[PDB]
Ligand binder design. Sequence first.
Ligand SMILES: CN(C)CCn1ccc2c(ccn2Cc2ccc(Cl)c(Cl)c2)c1=O
Ligand SMILES: CN(C)CCn1ccc2c(ccn2Cc2ccc(Cl)c(Cl)c2)c1=O
Ligand SMILES: CN(C)CCn1ccc2c(ccn2Cc2ccc(Cl)c(Cl)c2)c1=O
Ligand SMILES: CN(C)CCn1ccc2c(ccn2Cc2ccc(Cl)c(Cl)c2)c1=O
Lengths: 439, 456, 461, 439
Amino acid sequence: SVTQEDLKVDRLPGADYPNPSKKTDYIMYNPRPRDEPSSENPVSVSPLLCELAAARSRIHFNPTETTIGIVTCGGICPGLNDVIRSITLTGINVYNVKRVIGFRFGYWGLSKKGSQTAIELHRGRVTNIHHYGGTILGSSRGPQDPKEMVDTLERLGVNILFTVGGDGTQRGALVISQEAKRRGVDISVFGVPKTIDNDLSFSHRTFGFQTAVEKAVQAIRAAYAEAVSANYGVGVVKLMGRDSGFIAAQAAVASAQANICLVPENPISEQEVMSLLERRFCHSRSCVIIVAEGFGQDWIDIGVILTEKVKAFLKANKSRYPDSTVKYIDPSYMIRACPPSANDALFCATLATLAVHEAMAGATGCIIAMRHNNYILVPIKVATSVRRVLDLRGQLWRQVREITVDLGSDVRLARKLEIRRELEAINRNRDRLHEELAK
Amino acid sequence: MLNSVTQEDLKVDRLPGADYPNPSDKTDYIMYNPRPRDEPSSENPVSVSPLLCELAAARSRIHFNPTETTIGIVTCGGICPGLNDVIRSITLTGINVYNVKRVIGFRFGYWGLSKKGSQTAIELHRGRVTNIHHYGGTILGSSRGPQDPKEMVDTLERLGVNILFTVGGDGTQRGALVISQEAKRRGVDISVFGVPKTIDNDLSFSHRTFGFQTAVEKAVQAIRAAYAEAVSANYGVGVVKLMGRDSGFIAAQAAVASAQANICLVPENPISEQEVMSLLERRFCHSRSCVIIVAEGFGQDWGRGSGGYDASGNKKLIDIGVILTEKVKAFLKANKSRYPDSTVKYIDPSYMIRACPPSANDALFCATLATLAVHEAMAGATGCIIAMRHNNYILVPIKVATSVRRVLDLRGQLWRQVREITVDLGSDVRLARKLEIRRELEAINRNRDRLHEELA
Amino acid sequence: MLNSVTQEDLKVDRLPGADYPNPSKKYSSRTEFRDKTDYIMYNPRPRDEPSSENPVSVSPLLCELAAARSRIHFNPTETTIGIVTCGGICPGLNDVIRSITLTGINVYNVKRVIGFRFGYWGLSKKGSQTAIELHRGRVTNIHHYGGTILGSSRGPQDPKEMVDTLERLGVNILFTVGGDGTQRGALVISQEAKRRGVDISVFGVPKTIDNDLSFSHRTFGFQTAVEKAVQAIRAAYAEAVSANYGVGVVKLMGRDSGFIAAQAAVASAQANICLVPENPISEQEVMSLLERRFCHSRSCVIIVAEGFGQDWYDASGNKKLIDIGVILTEKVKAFLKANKSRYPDSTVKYIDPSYMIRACPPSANDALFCATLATLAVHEAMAGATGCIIAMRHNNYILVPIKVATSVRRVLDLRGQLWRQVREITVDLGSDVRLARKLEIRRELEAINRNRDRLHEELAK
Amino acid sequence: NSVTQEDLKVDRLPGADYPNPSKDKTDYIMYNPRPRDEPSSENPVSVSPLLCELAAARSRIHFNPTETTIGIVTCGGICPGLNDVIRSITLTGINVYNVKRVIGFRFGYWGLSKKGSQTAIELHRGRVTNIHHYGGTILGSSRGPQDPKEMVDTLERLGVNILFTVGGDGTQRGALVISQEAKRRGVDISVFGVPKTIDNDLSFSHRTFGFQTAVEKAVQAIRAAYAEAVSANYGVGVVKLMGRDSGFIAAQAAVASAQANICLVPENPISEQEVMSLLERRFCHSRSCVIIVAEGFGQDWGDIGVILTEKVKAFLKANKSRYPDSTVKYIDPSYMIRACPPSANDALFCATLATLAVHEAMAGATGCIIAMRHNNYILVPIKVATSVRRVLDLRGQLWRQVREITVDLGSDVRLARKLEIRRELEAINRNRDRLHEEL
Ligand SMILES: CN(C)CCn1ccc2c(ccn2Cc2ccc(Cl)c(Cl)c2)c1=O
Ligand SMILES: CN(C)CCn1ccc2c(ccn2Cc2ccc(Cl)c(Cl)c2)c1=O
Ligand SMILES: CN(C)CCn1ccc2c(ccn2Cc2ccc(Cl)c(Cl)c2)c1=O
Ligand SMILES: CN(C)CCn1ccc2c(ccn2Cc2ccc(Cl)c(Cl)c2)c1=O
């Protein structure tokens, strides 16, 4: 029940200035056809069209009179400094805006007390900041009074505010937008979605996620080495994922080293987990367990709890697992806090520049997202009403099930054929050697 | 001239019969162009294009009896980060999912299937592929050049190979469909299925090929080094050659990602030696360093090649890397007048970009392409490649795939980002510089006061 | 209570007889005569100033130098080599396994090489079943991966039962890769062996990431471990500077010494408090360092060694660990919560990168070091050395009897250059906070105002 | 060989009339800590009469800290760590000694000429904060001398009291000439060398800054060459690994990588014909060959990198007969080895060298370098330091490890190969039975 109206992104009234550098075009939400190939063109399975992001010929704000505002909120995420850098440099080099302000430590930065700390963003101040993790502005969780914030925006003459944060941040962003139009102030509030878990809807990718999976795989390589080094060794790795398991699932498949992958979308029992572990220890002396922070909220720190419960299980069963070892790893610090991969640096730069192009063109109350290889605008209202989750019947989760322990699979039948294939390889290698001597 | 892709061109071949169940359902499609003809209205939107692409997926009925099927793998041409992943995934998907009788790896490209190289061919089991994705190159090995299709299909028949995966560029797949035709010519049950290898990401009906994301990571590293060398010298010039035989996707993305390129030379934008030197000259107006990205395919009109081909059917190119470096030196030497001491370092990181293991993102992509390749080949697909487009995996007949290629849009967002960073002759040098200073003073004088405040 | 190490204590045992020539190092390849033991001075500092006579060591001790010998004890083609890895993994174990295996096979051409699985358990009659054959194929690339292909356990086994296995498999040399506890057991295997008059060499390759072996300036894995520590700190630093009154607590190995903590702290240049066992301070002292940091900064990074503050059952029924990382984090939180007054919003992130520091493959420099230690270990064990470790000291490879090696341990000198560099970077209650800060500013203004004018110059002219 | 204790006596400027703001006689370390006689009841005596002055912070210092200007110049090829040395000299000066001012001279000795003295930079805490995170030198670097007269004019003009010269043998040679020109006019100047040489060929040294980082990169270059080469039938990777006059990088990289089959260093000059017979022997029972070559090898040949590659190609052409398809890839990773930031171990080493350099220069040391030898930091007069150089011992343990890995013309090809096979069969046939057992 998402309607075309839900996808209509707001514009501030008027586009009375030319673009210093450079029709709304659309892309289909679902590019799959209703009917088979035929004489006429195919029609979408969905009625939804998404507004494409692009530099416009006419823009709302007089560039040389425009102040741009930036705020970063919530958990850090690889790429924040890139988004800060790109918004700042696109503003200055392309549109030549009067001023760019950075609000310190999240929404607190726009409160009358934190407005003191706000920083001037020039070319010099952002030159290399993309080389470092975190945010030069700083970040806090938690809202402020939208009234008090819009006072600061009016006071500093801020014309556009970029809100870099999760669902909660944009929810607040739309409330600033509405508080602004309620006074009839000329303010654009534009969201750059920050979410390492890539669980934004009307999106296939958010900045930081690809970088985060790189680090997750590194964490798993370490866990794997620890675990295979012990007799009945268990590496438990916690891989982000508050409400979705996209990092857990991709890391599990990429690493090719996960035997059990625990995600919120597939909530199983403590007892079920231990029988997967038990089946792994039938024909293996090590087990790597990926666990999303959001798994087993009905069992909070699932990392420590799963580790304690695995230990308890192995201790109860010393009988069969005589010496055992269980190492817990929390690489959260290492996954959020790094600078982005080159690919994520480019993605961040592209999101930020299109964000400025569209905000200057008077877009407001929207996020910028990337979907079907294209950059789209999405109203915050819809963006924050629905969220993304693993499809347990889809290709990614199928690849997790192919690698992870499955109680279905005949373990010892599967192993018979394994051996026959290996003998067939050995016996050929055996003869080719024999040949070389006499020959 | 317009290309003439028709829906018939996109219909991928199937070997006749799907008479066995899947150990582990109609063809679904995705629209080639998901942009609508008309604005939002009462009815659902309709594609600007009539073309539909076949989606890749595991099928319920399959052509080959899994337990009786031999899978063959061959890797051809320049190495590319991910080849071992594709080898590993084809091997493990075959064994763990379909439980195929045997998997053969053909050594050193098509040479591996010639009666001479068929000696060297290797048995691929789980043990033999366990960790091969951790290393660059190909455990099979790779050569440029075709062999006698007759002699190759002899080997395929001799070893009872039922599917052959061809991992290589346009030339390799062109040969793949020639194996397919030589096979049907004898009425043998063979699938020939392509996994596109091209680091330049210039396959059409594709937004991404395996290895490209990894290659851009390395290019940016090469640039970071060049940048350090160049900024260290007074009138220092780093020239970096970044792959790109016929397209500049690596050059362009590396240039934007690095944010350290001042001149980015790609084949799509052929400019003169004289134009390049005036970009350099303008850089040295208000800077003592310049980094120059150059695609191996740029400036094919700057010199004349021998006129020959390498064995794969690529033009033997004029080493534009060495030539651009010599011409920059010549220019700086002619103008010692204004560039009194100058330094020009040339860097060729080709070795480092192809030869590395894949990024985790490229490991996943390779693994996904390879498994869908096996799912579809088992379902009797043949004479096609697997590609990724609009976030989805599609099948494409080799015939169309090898008749069109991909190239930078000089009016598109990526190239716009290159032009925002690289030197622009347009902006009036010394006016442009006045405002630069005023902005920097305005920053300094604020920093100046905020300090003063803290004391009193 | 002084240590009582005499020159006799540094004489390393040799099994009686060196009755075979060296396959690789021929006696006729040298310039000078005699295949004797050469020595290096324990302490190369002189008693007296420069004078007419040569200088004399401040110490009487000489250490035996490690090197390939012209005569060897074991008949190479009849020799079985045994390898066992014990305790915490450490970057480089697979290199040491690989190098011992390949030096044995390629240089001496030994009959066979056995890998004992999961520590000393591998030599017990039960674990002797699991022992692996080590050939060229089985070790080709194992140095590319962290951990140990043999596996590792803590804990001793019955020396009697172990030497049964060594005799049963015809093992002539056993390399013991492990910490102090492992070598202590190694010497006990050696003595149990000589007690039956079996022809066995027991030779230690010291494993200790903390680099706290004595008669040593470097153990394999330590350089790699400091690389990872600095990476962990970069992350903690980013988390911390991102929060208003942000605190990164990083635990950096160091059971009984703080060499990783100290080097990481200096290298990173990002540590404001560095807590090592050698400098035991109070909870109250720590909080006043933090307090002084928050006078003129909104972030603090705290390095803490596992072994710091030893004087400071989980729900599932297991005994809960000595974990200064969790405790320091709780106590910092408690302090910040008591003082919300002045630190209104605060954040404390704890990082335990132990997993990431031990479990990685070695740096190229540590790969070389591992390869060198392992090959000299084989050269010397073949030359009949036993009851000793191989160590690296004053840029040279030496042999040390296990007895001495396990009676003394290494520790930070709090008056030495490394710890001085930590004190220069970390918060110091000495420097008067607000005067120190005045001059900071004046220096920055003096820089700004010059930059300011040089710009002004360019414009109109 | 003929080096005297007088040669090792390091100069001090007359007077140490001020206390140390942070923190006493000269201590020494034995040049050669090997004993003359066997172990005995008394302490052993050095084989050598030579003692080196140990570097350390002193209680009395020559320069009045608050009146002292420090000068820094970086010369010749960049080297991983230059920015660390710049940073540490600057911060040790400011934070420990509290010096009046610190100047950075741009683009080498040219920076001190009356023309380049214009470009010289003021170095404060802000200007050096993160410069160690980047390769190259924020000061810049040129080769070549300037008029020592003209340079000492600049030093007098800017009131420079200490000048740190970061560069190779040629740079320090010039440094001592500045020192002598300074004392020749009544100028209170310390000239103190921080040796820069990636090849680690400084004498009275076991390690120079950048060398450990450079070997890390060399091994990475080799891993790439190896992958290219093993991918081709009769594949040849030629890698050039620095080494103008010594092969320490070539040798360590070769051993560390374990992937070099031929390692060509200046210390072991062999013929083109000798190289090709190593290659020939490799291709008897192998289809790939990796060749490490130091830039200083074969200066008596036909840019040894391009020439060796051409000569290998020429050899493979019309031996097509036996090497039917062949491939020869040349790699020059010089750019990548010099231009990177230092390893954490090299960052620490750089920081340590720079701080001790300031401690000792403040204590009036001059006409000397700081070096690291037998795990200790020593001072060495430039005069001796630049009169002798370091090179591979072909009879030492490092080169022995290169010979163990690289192809050896000694071992009888076909007999050597028989035993290879027997060992492999003995492995295969055991693996073969253990499998059979399970069925
Ligand atoms: C209650 N809320 C604070 C946490 C749970 N959650 C998590 C994700 C989520 C919603 C609603 C939408 N989404 C997806 C999402 C993620 C990031 C952004 Cl920036 C946006 Cl606008 C939407 C959501 O409600
Ligand atoms: C003659 N050929 C050997 C070199 C020139 N070339 C280069 C690229 C190219 C074509 C035709 C299509 N393409 C793009 C491309 C890239 C990779 C693959 Cl696997 C395919 Cl099928 C097509 C093409 O003809
Ligand atoms: C009891 N032990 C398990 C922990 C305390 N400890 C720590 C270090 C240590 C000793 C005795 C000597 N050493 C230094 C050391 C480190 C590594 C090795 Cl392999 C050796 Cl032989 C000695 C020592 O007793
Ligand atoms: C002429 N020179 C530029 C090249 C040859 N060369 C190479 C090394 C060398 C000398 C003399 C001494 N050394 C070793 C060395 C290396 C670096 C430094 Cl900074 C010093 Cl003082 C000495 C030497 O003469």
